[PDB]
Amino acid sequence: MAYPMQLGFQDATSPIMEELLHFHDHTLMIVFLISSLVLYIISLMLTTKLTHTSTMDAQEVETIWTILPAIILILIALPSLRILYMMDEINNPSLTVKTMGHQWYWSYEYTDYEDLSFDSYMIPTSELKPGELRLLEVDNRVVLPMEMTIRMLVSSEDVLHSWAVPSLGLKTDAIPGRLNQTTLMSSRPGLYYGQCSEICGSNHSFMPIVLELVPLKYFEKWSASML
Amino acid sequence: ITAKPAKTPTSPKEQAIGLSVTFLSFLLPAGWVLYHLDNYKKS
Amino acid sequence: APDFHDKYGNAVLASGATFCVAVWVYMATQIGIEWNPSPVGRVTPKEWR
Amino acid sequence: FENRVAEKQKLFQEDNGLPVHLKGGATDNILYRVTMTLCLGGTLYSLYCLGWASFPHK
Amino acid sequence: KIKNYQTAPFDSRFPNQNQTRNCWQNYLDFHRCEKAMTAKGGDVSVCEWYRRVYKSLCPISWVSTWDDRRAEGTFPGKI
Amino acid sequence: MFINRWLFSTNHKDIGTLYLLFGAWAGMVGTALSLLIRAELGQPGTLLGDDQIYNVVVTAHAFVMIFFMVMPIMIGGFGNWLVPLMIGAPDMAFPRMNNMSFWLLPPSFLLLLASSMVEAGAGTGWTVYPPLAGNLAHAGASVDLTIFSLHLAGVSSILGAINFITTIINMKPPAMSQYQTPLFVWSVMITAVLLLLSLPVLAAGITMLLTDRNLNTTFFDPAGGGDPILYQHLFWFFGHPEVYILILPGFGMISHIVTYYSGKKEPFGYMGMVWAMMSIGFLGFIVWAHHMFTVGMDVDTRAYFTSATMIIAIPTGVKVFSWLATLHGGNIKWSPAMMWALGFIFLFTVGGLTGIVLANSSLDIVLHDTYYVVAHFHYVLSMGAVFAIMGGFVHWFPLFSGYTLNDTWAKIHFAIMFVGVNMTFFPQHFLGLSGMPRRYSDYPDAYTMWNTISSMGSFISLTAVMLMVFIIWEAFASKREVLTVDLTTTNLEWLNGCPPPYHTFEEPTYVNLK
Amino acid sequence: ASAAKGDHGGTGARTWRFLTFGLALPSVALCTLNSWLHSGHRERPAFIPYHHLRIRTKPFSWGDGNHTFFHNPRVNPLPTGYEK
Amino acid sequence: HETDEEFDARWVTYFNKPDIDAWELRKGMNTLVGYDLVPEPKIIDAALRACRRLNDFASAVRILEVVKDKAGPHKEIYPYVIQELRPTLNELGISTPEELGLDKV
Amino acid sequence: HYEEGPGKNIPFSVENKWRLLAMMTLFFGSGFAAPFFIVRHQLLKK
Amino acid sequence: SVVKSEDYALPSYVDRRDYPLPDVAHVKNLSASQKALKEKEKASWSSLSIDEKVELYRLKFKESFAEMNRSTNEWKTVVGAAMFFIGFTALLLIWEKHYVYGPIPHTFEEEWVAKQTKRMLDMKVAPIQGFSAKWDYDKNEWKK
Amino acid sequence: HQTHAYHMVNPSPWPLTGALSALLMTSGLTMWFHFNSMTLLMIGLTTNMLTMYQWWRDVIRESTFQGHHTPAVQKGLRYGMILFIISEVLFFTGFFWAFYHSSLAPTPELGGCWPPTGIHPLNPLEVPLLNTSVLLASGVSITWAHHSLMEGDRKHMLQALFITITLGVYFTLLQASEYYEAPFTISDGVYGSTFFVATGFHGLHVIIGSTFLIVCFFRQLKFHFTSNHHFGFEAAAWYWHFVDVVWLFLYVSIYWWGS
Amino acid sequence: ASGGGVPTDEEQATGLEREVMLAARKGQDPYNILAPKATSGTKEDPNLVPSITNKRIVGCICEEDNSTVIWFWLHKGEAQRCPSCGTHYKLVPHQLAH
Amino acid sequence: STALAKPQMRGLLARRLRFHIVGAFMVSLGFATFYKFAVAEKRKKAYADFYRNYDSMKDFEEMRKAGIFQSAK
Ligand SMILES: CCCCCCCCCCCCCCCCCC(=O)OCC(COC(=O)CCCCCCCCCCCCCCCCC)OC(=O)CCCCCCCCCCCCCCCCC
Ligand code: HEA
Ligand SMILES: CCCCC/C=C\C/C=C/C/C=C\C/C=C\CCCC(=O)O[C@H](COC(=O)CCCCCCCCCCCCCCCCC)COP(=O)(O)OCCN
Ligand SMILES: CCCCCC/C=C\CCCCCCCCCC(=O)O[C@H](COC(=O)CCCCCCCCCCCCCCC)COP(=O)(O)OC[C@@H](O)CO
Ligand SMILES: CCCCCCCCCCO[C@@H]1O[C@H](CO)[C@@H](O[C@H]2O[C@@H](CO)[C@@H](O)[C@H](O)[C@@H]2O)[C@H](O)[C@H]1O
Ligand code: CUA
Ligand SMILES: [O-][O-]
Ligand SMILES: [Cu+2]
Ligand SMILES: [Mg+2]
Ligand code: NA
Ligand code: NA
Numbered sequence A: 001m002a003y004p005m006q007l008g009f010q011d012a013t014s015p016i017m018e019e020l021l022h023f024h025d026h027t028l029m030i031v032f033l034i035s036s037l038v039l040y041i042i043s044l045m046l047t048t049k050l051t052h053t054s055t056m057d058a059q060e061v062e063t064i065w066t067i068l069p070a071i072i073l074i075l076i077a078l079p080s081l082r083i084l085y086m087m088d089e090i091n092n093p094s095l096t097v098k099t100m101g102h103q104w105y106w107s108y109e110y111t112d113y114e115d116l117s118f119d120s121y122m123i124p125t126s127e128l129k130p131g132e133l134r135l136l137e138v139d140n141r142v143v144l145p146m147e148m149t150i151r152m153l154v155s156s157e158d159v160l161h162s163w164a165v166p167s168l169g170l171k172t173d174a175i176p177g178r179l180n181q182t183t184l185m186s187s188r189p190g191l192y193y194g195q196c197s198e199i200c201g202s203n204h205s206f207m208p209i210v211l212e213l214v215p216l217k218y219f220e221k222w223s224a225s226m227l
Numbered sequence B: 001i002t003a004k005p006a007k008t009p010t011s012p013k014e015q016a017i018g019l020s021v022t023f024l025s026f027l028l029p030a031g032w033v034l035y036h037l038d039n040y041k042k043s
Numbered sequence C: 001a002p003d004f005h006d007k008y009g010n011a012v013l014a015s016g017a018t019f020c021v022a023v024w025v026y027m028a029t030q031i032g033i034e035w036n037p038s039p040v041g042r043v044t045p046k047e048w049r
Numbered sequence D: 001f002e003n004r005v006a007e008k009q010k011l012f013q014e015d016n017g018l019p020v021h022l023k024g025g026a027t028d029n030i031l032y033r034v035t036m037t038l039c040l041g042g043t044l045y046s047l048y049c050l051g052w053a054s055f056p057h058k
Numbered sequence E: 001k002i003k004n005y006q007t008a009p010f011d012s013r014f015p016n017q018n019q020t021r022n023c024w025q026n027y028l029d030f031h032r033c034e035k036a037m038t039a040k041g042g043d044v045s046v047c048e049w050y051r052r053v054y055k056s057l058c059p060i061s062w063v064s065t066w067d068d069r070r071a072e073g074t075f076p077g078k079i
Numbered sequence F: 001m002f003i004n005r006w007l008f009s010t011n012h013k014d015i016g017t018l019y020l021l022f023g024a025w026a027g028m029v030g031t032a033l034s035l036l037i038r039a040e041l042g043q044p045g046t047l048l049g050d051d052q053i054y055n056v057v058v059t060a061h062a063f064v065m066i067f068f069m070v071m072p073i074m075i076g077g078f079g080n081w082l083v084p085l086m087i088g089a090p091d092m093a094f095p096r097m098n099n100m101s102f103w104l105l106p107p108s109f110l111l112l113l114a115s116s117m118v119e120a121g122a123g124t125g126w127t128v129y130p131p132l133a134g135n136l137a138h139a140g141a142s143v144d145l146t147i148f149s150l151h152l153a154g155v156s157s158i159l160g161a162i163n164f165i166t167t168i169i170n171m172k173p174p175a176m177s178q179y180q181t182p183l184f185v186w187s188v189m190i191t192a193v194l195l196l197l198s199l200p201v202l203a204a205g206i207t208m209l210l211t212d213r214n215l216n217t218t219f220f221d222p223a224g225g226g227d228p229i230l231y232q233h234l235f236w237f238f239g240h241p242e243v244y245i246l247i248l249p250g251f252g253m254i255s256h257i258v259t260y261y262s263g264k265k266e267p268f269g270y271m272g273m274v275w276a277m278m279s280i281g282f283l284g285f286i287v288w289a290h291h292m293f294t295v296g297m298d299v300d301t302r303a304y305f306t307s308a309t310m311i312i313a314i315p316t317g318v319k320v321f322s323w324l325a326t327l328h329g330g331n332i333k334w335s336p337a338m339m340w341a342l343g344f345i346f347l348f349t350v351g352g353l354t355g356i357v358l359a360n361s362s363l364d365i366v367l368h369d370t371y372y373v374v375a376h377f378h379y380v381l382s383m384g385a386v387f388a389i390m391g392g393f394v395h396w397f398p399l400f401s402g403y404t405l406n407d408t409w410a411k412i413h414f415a416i417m418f419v420g421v422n423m424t425f426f427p428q429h430f431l432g433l434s435g436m437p438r439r440y441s442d443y444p445d446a447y448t449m450w451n452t453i454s455s456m457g458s459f460i461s462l463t464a465v466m467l468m469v470f471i472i473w474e475a476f477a478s479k480r481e482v483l484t485v486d487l488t489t490t491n492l493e494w495l496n497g498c499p500p501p502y503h504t505f506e507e508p509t510y511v512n513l514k
Numbered sequence G: 001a002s003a004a005k006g007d008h009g010g011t012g013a014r015t016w017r018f019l020t021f022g023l024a025l026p027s028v029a030l031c032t033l034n035s036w037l038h039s040g041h042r043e044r045p046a047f048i049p050y051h052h053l054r055i056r057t058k059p060f061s062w063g064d065g066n067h068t069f070f071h072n073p074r075v076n077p078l079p080t081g082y083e084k
Numbered sequence H: 001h002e003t004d005e006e007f008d009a010r011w012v013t014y015f016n017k018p019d020i021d022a023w024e025l026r027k028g029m030n031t032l033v034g035y036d037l038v039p040e041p042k043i044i045d046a047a048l049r050a051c052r053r054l055n056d057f058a059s060a061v062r063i064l065e066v067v068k069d070k071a072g073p074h075k076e077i078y079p080y081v082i083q084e085l086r087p088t089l090n091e092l093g094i095s096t097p098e099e100l101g102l103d104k105v
Numbered sequence I: 001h002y003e004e005g006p007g008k009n010i011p012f013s014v015e016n017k018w019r020l021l022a023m024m025t026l027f028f029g030s031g032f033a034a035p036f037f038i039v040r041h042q043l044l045k046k
Numbered sequence J: 001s002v003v004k005s006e007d008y009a010l011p012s013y014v015d016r017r018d019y020p021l022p023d024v025a026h027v028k029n030l031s032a033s034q035k036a037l038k039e040k041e042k043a044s045w046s047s048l049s050i051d052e053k054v055e056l057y058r059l060k061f062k063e064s065f066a067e068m069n070r071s072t073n074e075w076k077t078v079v080g081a082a083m084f085f086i087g088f089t090a091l092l093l094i095w096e097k098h099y100v101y102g103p104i105p106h107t108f109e110e111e112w113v114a115k116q117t118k119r120m121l122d123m124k125v126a127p128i129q130g131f132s133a134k135w136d137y138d139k140n141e142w143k144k
Numbered sequence K: 001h002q003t004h005a006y007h008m009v010n011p012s013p014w015p016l017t018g019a020l021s022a023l024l025m026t027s028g029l030t031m032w033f034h035f036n037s038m039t040l041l042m043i044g045l046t047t048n049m050l051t052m053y054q055w056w057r058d059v060i061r062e063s064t065f066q067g068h069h070t071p072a073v074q075k076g077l078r079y080g081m082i083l084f085i086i087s088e089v090l091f092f093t094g095f096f097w098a099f100y101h102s103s104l105a106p107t108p109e110l111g112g113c114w115p116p117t118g119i120h121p122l123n124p125l126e127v128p129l130l131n132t133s134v135l136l137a138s139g140v141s142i143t144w145a146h147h148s149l150m151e152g153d154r155k156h157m158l159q160a161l162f163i164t165i166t167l168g169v170y171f172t173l174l175q176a177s178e179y180y181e182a183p184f185t186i187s188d189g190v191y192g193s194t195f196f197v198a199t200g201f202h203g204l205h206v207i208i209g210s211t212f213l214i215v216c217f218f219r220q221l222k223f224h225f226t227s228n229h230h231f232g233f234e235a236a237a238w239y240w241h242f243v244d245v246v247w248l249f250l251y252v253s254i255y256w257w258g259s
Numbered sequence L: 001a002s003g004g005g006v007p008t009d010e011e012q013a014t015g016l017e018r019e020v021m022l023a024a025r026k027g028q029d030p031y032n033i034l035a036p037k038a039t040s041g042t043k044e045d046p047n048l049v050p051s052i053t054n055k056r057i058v059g060c061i062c063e064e065d066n067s068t069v070i071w072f073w074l075h076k077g078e079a080q081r082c083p084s085c086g087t088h089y090k091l092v093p094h095q096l097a098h
Numbered sequence M: 001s002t003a004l005a006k007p008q009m010r011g012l013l014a015r016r017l018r019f020h021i022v023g024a025f026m027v028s029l030g031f032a033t034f035y036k037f038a039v040a041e042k043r044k045k046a047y048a049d050f051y052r053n054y055d056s057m058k059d060f061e062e063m064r065k066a067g068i069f070q071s072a073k
């Protein structure tokens, strides 16, 4: 989850989110440098009483100012597109889990072997147990085995929603009539939070996601106890 | 640009009046609504 | 002849500056705003379970 | 039919300072007044219908 | 006859984020196979794989609505 | 006389004045809605109600600031006043149809206020996506009043576009080629082609939404074989060009302000600026799916929309550098309008740079529908389009009125607004990176500090807006009448005095071919 | 293509009139023949209550709310089947 | 483009034209100052003598002020230009802006 | 014809600066006040 | 001297350091003694007094370069008034907190925060850099 | 007195009355959809027609009767009409995009096929082929009308323009009959939605273009057009070719290829 | 196959349309449809700028292909010069009214 | 006294531009070096050192014992 006064991304929980962090660091340096160079050149242009107001020849300098940005763009797009396809790669999941968006809560279905399904609703602020996070806790968490490739399939039974877990780098829209696929692999056990990320009516702010990542043996006994 | 001196000068005091009246005109109705929000909600 | 800024420049800068610092420091500290700063180095963690 | 365009050009070029939309005569005035009465009439009725639709009917 | 099924494997016919046709095709394959079998004096157990795959992929409410519509005579796919 | 003059106008200056007054009023409406947003978010918990009332306010803020404030001021107000002066034309091609473009906007704004008054308003986002926006999740009149409001604003602008294109092509002096018209004139013509090509596609998509809501069509409804994602394509097909429509007249006013207060007779690299604005208009039509990176699109499609969106940086960078090269060697006049333009150049560049971060589909997975996007688009709208508007307004106020503003108050106004908009939006980058979604009426506790500062900033912008009203009142109250304006040889719109006669260029300019 | 006519001396009224009467109208008269021949009613199909057809998310703003604007009793069944 | 020497020569020629008129004098000075240079003493010398032929004392003093202005922060250039112009200032009776108190704000 | 010149090419009068202040206050003040009142109208329904 | 509105189409005077010789004289009407001064300017300028030379300059031009380029105290007024209106804004924020905002949620109470902080540490929130990485699980305190 | 060739238009009330008619039509439709009532709608449609009538009337007064349409003004009208047509092409483009999107990827609710299960398309060789022959024939008649007008032949102009209008009316009556005979409706999923909305707006455009042609026919009867100056006829002809070309696209995409 | 019955412009054009038509037949351009061709622009050979009043705005495109146009009012009297290139212009006032 | 030396009088603005743009370029290289050492590599090294001897089961057992989990007591 996010922590107070946070500036940047939540720490990466998956190899893909870690790649996004390094690619954002690379792109932010380019953003700072270009922004800084603009500000500095503006201040340069404005700090002299020397003048030169006759017609100025443009084509020479226009070369520099088209080619250097072209090159900067290629140096962004190369790692950008490496990551895109890296994310698209085949992986062979061990498990498929569906989630259906509703106004205003998520349901989950794990139907590889038994018909396991349940609803996951925000814990109302009046019923949080001490230590618990406002707007973020659910009653029934989405228990998943850690260190394993999981296919998440996302849709909705009413309006649009969007299923997101920032520290895994995940966000997949929940569209009715459509089954969208993403993959999820957590490098660590623990609790990982997200929130509905498409506007969906009165309780849009109040239909969060919590993944509980644990060892496979714990996952299997939990699954059996949820039948 | 150059311009003539004002045809109808607005002194510091007339400006303080135009400024107050202008601010009050945005502040007082919205202030009245935000102030009475509770009345509206648990009504 | 001295204009408005020759005559009143210093006092407007001095008074604007002082008023601005005073009222923002008051607003930031004295009326119960919850800034929700980092607990790091500030909060002693307490048993919750 | 006969080509009576020359008569209409004399009528519409008469130096009587009327704007083009009234320059055909009294009938233009009538048609103008009917249009603008319906428009202004209808617009007040739309405001009435907004204010009616603004409140629940129970 | 090839099991230890965990979940539905990658299928090169449906390589993209939208998996709706994967669920749909496997639902049709299972019910088509069952119909061939139920009729011709053979056994539905040969249809198993399609049933596993569509059970894995398809939202419960889709299967349930599609089942209701086969019952009703209103299922628009060809079986 | 008064009705003849102001309700029946066929005069491009008076119509330009009507659009400035209409846009200035809408601006107060958009500002109030923007303060209601930041009041809800200014402390943790619930102020107004749940997300429905909150999102009615967010939707209306966006529609009013875009359709009733920026477009009518830049295109209706400045385009109408300055375009015919700048080409020595006696009026617009269609001076009577120009007046109906104006007169369709109060009805459109009435339909938008009506939607917020009936039922529970349209809490949809200004993108109005179904199914949230269809007849089951938004039953009753509000969304239909919204779609009608858009149809009238879309008609007002299509007819305007036709009028502006025809005027700029057909009514220049016969010696003046298109490559001897000023940059602002080019920016309005390019904007008008974008309006012409993009608004009919919007009108088709919102029409289809109207019929799924009222005539039992299922364009966007899967039960009938329709697709919610089809609406998003048709909307963004308009929606991307529409943000180039919101900035291009800004770019043209910026070129003229920067050239003027540098004491230059011409902008650096004129044909490069023409090139850049046409390239931006073109590439602005082939990139719309970068609003749809998380909907479930094929990876090659994502890859294409990434790269084509990024290319827009090249022509856009030639313009930023050419503004800097126009300042180079200038006799710099530190007027309040020049401060708005300098602010524009730096803060539009920061916001164009975070648009570049967002072009990367991979990173956009995590940034999409978060406040990082909100920070992006306010750097370019509140510190880009709005800065060009304020720069343009204070520069041309003496032309349009015949009176001077007090420059010291206008500098004060600048400084306040500059502090408030940066305070408001800068910390939204951090709320974005850290995961705070869009269109939330309340947020997990962790997000408290940046939301508190953000809302304090929005109150500082409030104070600037109120002060701006006083500053315009003070000008009209003192009546300091303009005498001489510099650089008229390269700024034709000043050449007929301040304000120009009701009729100008009754006798056309003389320009020979040579 | 050249279609297979000829002509081109010049572009005149006389030519476009030739084409209106010697090609365009006779094509209309021939399609008029073709259509008003394959006319006559076809056997309405068995009614099946498909959920993707006869959609009703909101009543129509005319009649009884359940009839389409150009409702034809012979060939347009209602959500509950054909009219009796 | 041309050498610096040929640039200067074209400007000395422009101002030396015996019957240069007031318009040409103004157009020449107003164009000249748009360039990224402070004009060589020989060019200023020729402009001053055109001022003389035109019976225009005040424009002579303004041409000296604009030389100071074009130097920007390079405070060494103007007194060097005046040093070089001294015999012409003496021969023509042209007082500098500083001798006239016109450098006082 | 129509009046030409400063203060005369506008649909509002600037003849008296205090009447102007009241007209401008009503003009900008009603734009800014409208969304507060619509919020209040919404809350008061339900 | 007096510039009129009805003169806009006529060449006009301007003081600009980039346009040193404007299109008209600052003063065109001459008194008797100013006329005599212009006749005397046709003879040697060495015979003009210092006052005559100043007067000739002031007929031609309005302000000298040092006068037109002078700096002002305007920044003081500007920065001071800006800070005044910014400090005004904090009064609005005071009013809002007093009369509009109710209590913030109980999850900001000091004991809640300490427990929640413990729980975030137990679940190792951001263990690599952002949060739990700053806690020393061995010494049971915040890292120095 | 002006010494340029452009038209300074008399101050007019029609922009206001047309804008208010737009308010009255949109709020009328809202009232009809949500409050069971037609009144505001029929008031809007009335003031809309009145507005169009007076405004285009005055254009005829200012051109034919007052002589303000110099060549420069005509050229501007030419651009205006072309740009207007461009806008209408892009409006139809959004409905073709809708149609291809749904028919190229038919969803499971449709049976995953196109045409959907339970849809029986019209035979494109019957009335739709007749409609096609009609509009193409009317493209040939209106070109004859144009050439006769340029050559100064009032009788053949009138004859060809009349045959053109008669075909436009024919198409409209055939289309009205196919709507009534169609076994599917607008409520029959995305098939009926794309079908009736796209052909419905096309048919609305046939009705507008046929009205514009009838206006040219009466102004011709009254000798308003000269052999060289007749832009309203040219604008009506361009618009009629646009309505023809849209049809050909509908016929190939929806009736033939989507069958 | 063809009779008449269609009026011509010569018979039926009126107003400013007719004034333009008739002036064009005389080789005249009273409504400024055409771009004037420049003379050499010297003081002996100035660009002659017709006007119906005592001043007219000139735009000067000093060199072929300049995008920047130099605008200034030209007044009755002595020839004036473009402030950018010095080319000479002279106003030739009056009449148009036949 | 002494005459003053002839100073450079031409290309003063161009010269200043050239010197500062090259200044800007050398600062830009210095900043990227700071950036790649203070932010980017720092990140790469915090991640790699975290996971070098990371024991995920031991991490799980500490969380379980602290009572955070629904599926694992
Ligand atoms: C408003 C209150 C902000 C509170 C600041 C938070 C405290 C920092 C903790 C102090 C540090 C403590 C250690 C924590 C390290 C965490 C690193 C991280 O995880 O990394 C991610 C972070 C890292 O960001 C930061 O580290 C702070 C931003 C620094 C950017 C320079 C601007 C200076 C900002 C401060 C004043 C704002 C004025 C707006 C400046 C104008 C708009 C840019 O998040 C971002 O990506 C923000 C995205 C910004 C994109 C816009 C680029 C604009 C650049 C302008 C260049 C012109 C030069 C300024 C010259 C500026 C003069 C005009
Ligand atoms: C005036 C408004 C405006 C403008 C001009 C732009 C300009 C751009 N925008 Fe943005 N944007 C919006 C308004 C605007 N935007 C709005 C309202 C939204 C959200 C809509 C919604 O959902 O409601 C949005 C959303 C949006 C998204 C969707 C993000 C998402 O929702 O997840 C994306 C994705 O690419 C995008 C990108 C860009 C880019 C690349 C540009 C480019 O045009 C910027 C180009 C400029 C520069 C790059 C800076 C100047 C250049 C240089 C100095 C040269 C060197 C630079 C480099 C080498 C990189 N924007
Ligand atoms: C006769 C041949 C030509 C047809 C014309 C006849 C009448 C309709 C007029 C045309 C308007 C065009 C399209 C508008 C929407 C739908 C109409 C589609 C054409 C049509 O008429 O569809 C009929 C349905 O009409 C219905 O719902 C009727 C609903 C009528 C209300 C119109 C709804 C509002 C229209 C939206 C206008 C927005 C305009 C866009 C503005 C653009 C701004 C830039 C088909 O009838 P059916 O019984 O379902 O099936 C036949 C079974 N035997
Ligand atoms: C069922 C109906 C419901 C909706 C109502 C629509 C009804 C139908 C209206 C049909 C359109 C009628 C147009 C009549 C125009 C007559 C005026 C005219 O045609 O004027 C001509 C100028 O062109 C001009 O303005 C030309 C301007 C004409 C543009 C018209 C084009 C279509 C507009 C219709 C709106 C489309 C709506 C589509 C929905 C998205 C006049 O110049 P000339 O002809 O050169 O004459 C001069 C000579 O005499 C000199 O010798
Ligand atoms: C988002 C923009 C808004 C920013 C905040 C504006 C600052 C508010 C300005 C003052 O507003 C007034 O405040 C009074 C309180 O100070 C309210 O009086 C209420 O207060 C009581 C005093 O407690 C009573 O005396 C009165 O009857 C009254 O209703 C009054 O109605 C309201 O107009
Ligand atoms: Cu579900 Cu937002
Ligand atoms: O749209 O960016
Ligand atoms: Cu976009
Ligand atoms: Mg989204
Ligand atoms: Na809140
Ligand atoms: Na023709």
Ligand SMILES: [Zn+2]
Pocket: L060, L061, L062, L063, L070, L082, L083, L084, L085, L086, L087
């Ligand atoms: Zn020139």
